Amino acid sequence: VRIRKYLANYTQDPSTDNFYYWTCVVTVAYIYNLLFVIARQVFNDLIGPSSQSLCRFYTTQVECTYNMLTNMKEMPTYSQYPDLGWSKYWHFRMLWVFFDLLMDCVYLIDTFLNYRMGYMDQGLVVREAEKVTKAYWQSKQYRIDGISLIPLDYILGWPIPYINWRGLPILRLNRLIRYKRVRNCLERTETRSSMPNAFRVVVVVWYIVIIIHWNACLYFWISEWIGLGTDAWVYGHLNKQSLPDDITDTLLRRYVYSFYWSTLILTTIGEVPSPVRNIEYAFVTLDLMCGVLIFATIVGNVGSMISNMSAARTEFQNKMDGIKQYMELRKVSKQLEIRVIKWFDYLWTNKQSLSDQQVLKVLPDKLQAEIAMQVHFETLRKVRIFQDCEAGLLAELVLKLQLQVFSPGDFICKKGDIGREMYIVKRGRLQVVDDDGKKVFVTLQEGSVFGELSILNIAGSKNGNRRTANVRSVGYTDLFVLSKTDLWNALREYPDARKLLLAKGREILKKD
Amino acid sequence: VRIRKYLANYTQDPSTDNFYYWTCVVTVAYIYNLLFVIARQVFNDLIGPSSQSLCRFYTTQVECTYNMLTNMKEMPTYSQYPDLGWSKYWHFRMLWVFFDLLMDCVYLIDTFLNYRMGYMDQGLVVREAEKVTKAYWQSKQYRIDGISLIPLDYILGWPIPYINWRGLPILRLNRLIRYKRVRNCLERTETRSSMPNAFRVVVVVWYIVIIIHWNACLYFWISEWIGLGTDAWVYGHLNKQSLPDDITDTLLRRYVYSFYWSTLILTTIGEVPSPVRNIEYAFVTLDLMCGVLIFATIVGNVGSMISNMSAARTEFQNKMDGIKQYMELRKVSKQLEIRVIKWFDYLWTNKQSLSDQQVLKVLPDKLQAEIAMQVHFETLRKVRIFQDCEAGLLAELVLKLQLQVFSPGDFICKKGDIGREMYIVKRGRLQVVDDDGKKVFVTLQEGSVFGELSILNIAGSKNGNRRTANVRSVGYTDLFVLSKTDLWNALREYPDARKLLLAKGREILKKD
Amino acid sequence: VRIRKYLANYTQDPSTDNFYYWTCVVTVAYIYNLLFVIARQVFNDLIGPSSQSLCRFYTTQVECTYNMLTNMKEMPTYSQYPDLGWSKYWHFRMLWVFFDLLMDCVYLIDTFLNYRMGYMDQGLVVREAEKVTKAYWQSKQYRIDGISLIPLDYILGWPIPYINWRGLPILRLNRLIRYKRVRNCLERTETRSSMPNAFRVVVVVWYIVIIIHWNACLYFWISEWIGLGTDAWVYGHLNKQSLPDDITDTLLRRYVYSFYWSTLILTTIGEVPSPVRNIEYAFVTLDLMCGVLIFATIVGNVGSMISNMSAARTEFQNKMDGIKQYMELRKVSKQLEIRVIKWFDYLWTNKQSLSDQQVLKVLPDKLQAEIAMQVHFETLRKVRIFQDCEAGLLAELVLKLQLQVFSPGDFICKKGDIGREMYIVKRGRLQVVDDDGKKVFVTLQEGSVFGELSILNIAGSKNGNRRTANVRSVGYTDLFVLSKTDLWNALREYPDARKLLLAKGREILKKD
Amino acid sequence: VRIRKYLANYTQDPSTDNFYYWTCVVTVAYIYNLLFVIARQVFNDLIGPSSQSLCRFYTTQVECTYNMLTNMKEMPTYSQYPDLGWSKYWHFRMLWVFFDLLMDCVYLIDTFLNYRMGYMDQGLVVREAEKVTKAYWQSKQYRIDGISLIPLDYILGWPIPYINWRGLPILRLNRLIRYKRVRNCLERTETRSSMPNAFRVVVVVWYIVIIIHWNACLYFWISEWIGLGTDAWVYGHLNKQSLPDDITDTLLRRYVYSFYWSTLILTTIGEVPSPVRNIEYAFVTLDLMCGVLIFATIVGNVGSMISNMSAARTEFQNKMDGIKQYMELRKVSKQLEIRVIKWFDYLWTNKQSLSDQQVLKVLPDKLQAEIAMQVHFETLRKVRIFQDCEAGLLAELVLKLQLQVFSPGDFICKKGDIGREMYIVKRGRLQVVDDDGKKVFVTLQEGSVFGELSILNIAGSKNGNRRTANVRSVGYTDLFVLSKTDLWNALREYPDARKLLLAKGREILKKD
């Protein structure tokens, strides 16, 4: 009663996390097919030899031991089993059948979830069973789902002794049409990964191994079709690189040498025997060319994926080289040169180089505002004008605060310079020093606001546009820099902050 | 009567589609020449052996069977036919002559179309016979047309028995001067292709095969000039890679081994016998160097052509990595981090990432306006101000509408925030919720307009610059964002839309 | 009397063309030294054998014929000549001495020109003998000039029989310090070249050959120091790749095999015998590593130099692919899609794609104005307002004219649209059509001005800001587009053009 | 008394130069470990053979001479020493122990400096012992410091005869965890280097050698584990490339051949014997793949590091090619073309191409102002308005002066053109010529100011906006170009400079 209702009214939401784990499960079944269907077609002892080897021994033909598959002057001749080896290797073949049925159950569950898959209508996922089933039926998706599930390998994919049918494991290649779920899994995996480049490198290493594996099966398929041990390019006793002295011909040897051959050919090292026949020349020429073009792309990418792991450092280093080269040409003094270099060094050890323009550039301004208001929360909690006034002021200004770094001696404001900006202390410590020297009057910590007196337009005192005091950085200071125009936009829109700023500035000026 | 008049007053328009198909036809003739002229010069059994081979047999010289061209301890010595083999291979040579004459008829028709080719005078094609023929005569094009048609290969390009002339198929290389039509065909083919990168890859694969083919003919030409089977670098019985044991020396073998040799040399694999003579050292050194430099360019391009197949994804992935790296450093909360990541995920599954700036950047603004008015036609058909007013409003505004994506919970307008933009719903659904919570008052679907009350300047009510209500996104919303300045430009130019907007806003405000 | 005065008061101007030809002459002497000093040190039979070879013949030692330097079971042993072969090869050695003295005369003339070389003081070249000689003496240039001329190879660089001195041609390597003149020659050659990329490719091909040549001399130097024919890596009879069967050991063979060896090692093909001794392992390891790193840079550049030969086409093709991909996603109609594609096709066949932003970007505005006024001279000669008024108008406006391309049907102005620009016809033909259809009133050719009526502010008629007529492009039109703001700047500065434009517009409007 | 107090209250400042030299010292100890720990594990005769070799001689076993390790038909069998060779090689082992203890003392001093390391609190370094020690204890740094110092190689890393313990030098690999100090040393070294790219190339060459060295030890470890001289891939007498004829098996030979093997495998040259066993196939396949991927990245970088050594020249050359290509298409006259080319040539020989935008872009405006005021100090000392007025004028303007280069004939101001800029002469010489020709009235050297009369707004004379005279460049001139808007900002803020400029202009105009 419960199961019937639940499956009757079930509908899948594609944007969950359980669905992501499910697509990760489907990728495992896809990789299973991708490797082992071609493996079992070409190396057909993966299910069980299905024939005995019958080496000629010295006189008469006997079944081969491992000592007879070593240093052999001839290849063995196979004699089919009466039951195609089902009595001997039914356990191997039932393991294979179990894993095949398991991956096909994965495919069936994926087909059901496709049949009941919610879709986005207006930003919202439609999760009504009738709508999702109709959208499935009119989406031509049942074609891909059905072609990928035709159980044609259960009939003709296994050795049937009565018909003397040898099996065609390649009939299971129709499972490889569900590549879209696998492609979506990898994209969502790298979109969710905290180590995106490491995942990309792992995925490309998987691509390389799958390519070399399919090419190994290609090489051994062609070797077996031409005939093993017939010339010195084909795997066999005449190759002498595949079967040296004291090396036994086994199923592991056939795959190991084929994987090695494909590695050397696809990387265009080519330290493998040369073709003997026209068909082998055609195969090897086409294969080397694929290897050149194809591993070009791939290996080129891998080096570029391992570039971008360090590209912020490279941009920093280009700017820094450009500045050093400028300063050495123009013969700038060494004091100023080391000051600039130390500024860059500090700006690097604290990772403030350029890591705001990305968020600024691509995100929507409300997301940028929320991120910035969260990152600088403890700093902007101390700011007085922000703490007790309208909050729209805080938001509108928070998007318009530039962060600048000053050196241990720099003067942020000099007593008669010009008033264009106001500053909020993000880090560091400053001093309002007496004119020309010591006698520090007050000290400014994080959260302090200074510089408004000039860019406000109080009618009270004479200077009007000039700095009223000197402000000297004690160590390295990080300051928010708010322009005069931005301040006045946000003030003409918010009267209470204007009144507070003007009153405090008026008091400071009256006290002189 | 009809044919004479038609050809008398015919003139070609180069910008048709039939002319594009014609240039595609000319490319086929060009490729025919490109491959088979050098093929027939170097491998001169393509027209027929023209001499018998005369292997020494055991004693006396007899004509070679295929069993005598296998495992040979010496190369055969050729004895010319009395009639240069015309009696035996007249059918092969007449097939070759037919295809030569067919491609030369293609060249003649192309020359006529060049003679009668219209040209652009003032954006218009001139299709007066007198003008086009004069422009042809004064364009030095008859030089290229004539040099490429000198029928010098019909006299001296075939075996003439009486003169004991062996033939010079290389005299047909003057046909290879019409490369400009072929270059224009490929450029127009990739400009018309819906799969531009696939076509580029196919064209480069053709370039590679033609280069390896010409180098194969070069290698066999040099081998034959030096003398076949004279050392172990030259094709012959001493090479032992060209002619292994049980391999017959045939015309197919000579081309297969030469193509393989050129593949290994031009890709700098070099698993071929080493030069024996100074001339062979010079040839192989020059050839490997050409191979290194030349396949550098080419193979480098192919990897770069297969890069750009996925470059939007790469830009997206760079932005996304930069943002993730920023947020992990600054220790932004995980809720906001997954909100940002889900925003990016949605923005990718719908391909809105950056695919408007291209059309915006390169096209003329009238074309951009027409494309945009067509793409968003069903959306902008619902917009009321656009549906019933002057159409110039729709155009002028349609170029100034930015599209922004909001998340399932975001507030587009909060009751006291600031009015700077107005929004038109492209997708999604919104709600005008009561202050702080539920009690949704109205729902906004695609085509709805909201946000104007603030950026209009109605004198009626108090807020003036503030939002009058809260608008919350239900799911993911795509909104057109029209600034206040753009709205007011288009309104000060169009009075009826201004009156409509002001009247509707006045009613909404009076109802409060 | 004449020569003494002339050389007394002579001073060189470095920016002439004769001086450029002179630096080209100096480059020839530099390349002479670069190749042949190391060639003569390592392959010391370039001046004459200087010893006889003394092969053992069958019994006793006799001088080697060429038939005794072939298939040799041992290397010959050299016995020095009494006079070090001066009697036999004085003609070879006097040819070498003549070319050495000629290149040293080139160096002396270059030293004199350096001693009397004018320099820039204030944009002007100082050509007073006293000043240039003083600047030379205080410039530390006499050091480079003298070190590069020490005639130490005339004493100890040749075989002196009496001292039994064998010669040290390597003492002429001090000539290779004058590389600055050679580097300046190549930079000025590519700055003056009309085929810059072809010259760069030629220069890099020269770099490659010089590197392989020096490495060949390195290999043979090490082979001779270790001892020739001592192992199977060193050039000699045991190598069997350097001296195969029927190959004679000659001076040409020693250089041919060494150049081939260096080609294979520096390109990391490595199809050469493997090292036998620890010193040879060290040499070959260091050499392959240099080859990998060094030919990386070089071959990488060559592919990049052959990229930029086609980079405008690549940028065009990226824009065009981006637009096609946008339009296929958004399902834009096929009519508009082919219109956009044909627009791009035309814009390519006429090379108007982006080839103005370079000149705009890097040049000074007066140079840009002069170039533009020359390029569009025949077009702007027809423009009436430009032909008869102040010329400052023409200049100031000519820098502010954007060129736009319209399609065969496009409407440039529609009767009620908005007036923001004015147009000047660069190419093509337009029509002032009746509203909605035919009845063309007037036709506009190159040089015609239209569109001002709207952006002028005549008080006469009602429209004021609207187009008074429709203007339809007949074929493809190229138009200068002058904004309204630029027009009014240049008009408020120039009253006569303002009066002319206003009067003509007033007449047109009054005639309606 | 002194030492105890000094070490009691000592605290380290990380930003000194002595600390940088200390991190350079620590890098030497790190490289010591990196090379020689694995070297001593794999090639265990680095401390002393510890067993005799016992070659079979002809009959009976005797200790091997060097003549018995040459051309050997079998490998020697080792018989352990009673005291593990401590009596023979105690001097070698005490040298090794001394260097181990020295590097461990370096590690201990580094651990003490970490324990007493100052940190930045607010731009300032905290140098109170209590605070720095607490911050150390709560920073999990003692974990890295302790794991890297576990003296487990002093007990079990050396041959102990009594226990018959052979030694495990690999137990010293825990020292390789202090890679952070080494990474910081290299980054600070390239940030302080005046030759940044040379240092990067040296660092990458070190990376390559360390990788090949570790892979050599890997190869010999696997060869020894499999068994030396057992097949033809393993180092030994059957390899015949490792031990040719007349080559003695020594410790130097084992490392030389292994380094060569790793060079050929990691650079995918592969001219080494092919694997014989499945384990060797697996090793070589994994190794070639690492070599392909890994040397991809590395060698790709090296070519890119040697690119950027010349990237300013490449940008210059791209601009110059673009302009030449534009001018050849549009058929600009040859006089103007050579004028443009000579302008570019001069702009290159003086390195003014684009080398200001870097400093402008990345630095803070106060640093830019200080650099610019220092670079142009001697030029701006001559400027009159700057020399005697408020200094804020000099600063505010100095950031807003663009530098432009004019040709030997160019007219900077023509008598009736328009006044928008003012100029200050940086280099070169100009003339105020009479209208149309000669009669030069005055000459302007470096420091002269001209062009203000037009952009000032004196009411005195008629022209108002026009140039009052012609100014012609004599040779190449470099001028500071100050816009009119910038001049008037800085003048409305500074009254005395305004009065001076207006008075001088008034006098000049009154004198006419």
From Swiss-Prot, chains A, B, C, D:
<keyword id="KW-0142">cGMP-binding</keyword>
<keyword id="KW-0407">Ion channel</keyword>
<feature type="binding site">
    <location>
        <position position="467"/>
    </location>
    <ligand>
        <name>3',5'-cyclic GMP</name>
    </ligand>
</feature>
<feature type="region of interest" description="Selectivity filter">
    <location>
        <begin position="268"/>
        <end position="271"/>
    </location>
</feature>
<feature type="binding site">
    <location>
        <position position="468"/>
    </location>
    <ligand>
        <name>3',5'-cyclic GMP</name>
    </ligand>
</feature>
<keyword id="KW-0524">Neurogenesis</keyword>
<dbReference type="GO" id="GO:0005223">
    <property type="term" value="F:intracellularly cGMP-activated cation channel activity"/>
</dbReference>
<dbReference type="GO" id="GO:0016020">
    <property type="term" value="C:membrane"/>
</dbReference>
<feature type="binding site">
    <location>
        <position position="454"/>
    </location>
    <ligand>
        <name>3',5'-cyclic GMP</name>
    </ligand>
</feature>
<dbReference type="GO" id="GO:0097543">
    <property type="term" value="C:ciliary inversin compartment"/>
</dbReference>
<dbReference type="GO" id="GO:0048812">
    <property type="term" value="P:neuron projection morphogenesis"/>
</dbReference>
<feature type="binding site">
    <location>
        <position position="512"/>
    </location>
    <ligand>
        <name>3',5'-cyclic GMP</name>
    </ligand>
</feature>
<dbReference type="GO" id="GO:0045664">
    <property type="term" value="P:regulation of neuron differentiation"/>
</dbReference>
<dbReference type="GO" id="GO:0007635">
    <property type="term" value="P:chemosensory behavior"/>
</dbReference>
<dbReference type="GO" id="GO:0006935">
    <property type="term" value="P:chemotaxis"/>
</dbReference>
<dbReference type="GO" id="GO:0009454">
    <property type="term" value="P:aerotaxis"/>
</dbReference>
<dbReference type="GO" id="GO:0005222">
    <property type="term" value="F:intracellularly cAMP-activated cation channel activity"/>
</dbReference>
<keyword id="KW-1071">Ligand-gated ion channel</keyword>
<comment type="similarity">
    <text>Belongs to the cyclic nucleotide-gated cation channel (TC 1.A.1.5) family.</text>
</comment>
<dbReference type="GO" id="GO:0098655">
    <property type="term" value="P:monoatomic cation transmembrane transport"/>
</dbReference>
<dbReference type="GO" id="GO:0030516">
    <property type="term" value="P:regulation of axon extension"/>
</dbReference>
<comment type="subunit">
    <text>Homotetramer.</text>
</comment>
<feature type="region of interest" description="C-linker">
    <location>
        <begin position="311"/>
        <end position="388"/>
    </location>
</feature>
<dbReference type="GO" id="GO:0003031">
    <property type="term" value="P:detection of carbon dioxide"/>
</dbReference>
<dbReference type="GO" id="GO:0070482">
    <property type="term" value="P:response to oxygen levels"/>
</dbReference>
<dbReference type="GO" id="GO:0034703">
    <property type="term" value="C:cation channel complex"/>
</dbReference>
<feature type="transmembrane region" description="Helical; Name=S6">
    <location>
        <begin position="278"/>
        <end position="303"/>
    </location>
</feature>
<feature type="transmembrane region" description="Helical; Name=S1">
    <location>
        <begin position="24"/>
        <end position="46"/>
    </location>
</feature>
<feature type="transmembrane region" description="Helical; Name=P-helix">
    <location>
        <begin position="255"/>
        <end position="277"/>
    </location>
</feature>
<keyword id="KW-0145">Chemotaxis</keyword>
<feature type="binding site">
    <location>
        <position position="271"/>
    </location>
    <ligand>
        <name>Na(+)</name>
    </ligand>
</feature>
<dbReference type="GO" id="GO:0005886">
    <property type="term" value="C:plasma membrane"/>
</dbReference>
<feature type="topological domain" description="Extracellular">
    <location>
        <begin position="47"/>
        <end position="89"/>
    </location>
</feature>
<dbReference type="GO" id="GO:0007602">
    <property type="term" value="P:phototransduction"/>
</dbReference>
<keyword id="KW-0547">Nucleotide-binding</keyword>
<keyword id="KW-1003">Cell membrane</keyword>
<feature type="binding site">
    <location>
        <position position="451"/>
    </location>
    <ligand>
        <name>3',5'-cyclic GMP</name>
    </ligand>
</feature>
<feature type="topological domain" description="Extracellular">
    <location>
        <begin position="224"/>
        <end position="254"/>
    </location>
</feature>
<dbReference type="GO" id="GO:0005249">
    <property type="term" value="F:voltage-gated potassium channel activity"/>
</dbReference>
<feature type="topological domain" description="Cytoplasmic">
    <location>
        <begin position="304"/>
        <end position="512"/>
    </location>
</feature>
<keyword id="KW-1133">Transmembrane helix</keyword>
<dbReference type="GO" id="GO:0042802">
    <property type="term" value="F:identical protein binding"/>
</dbReference>
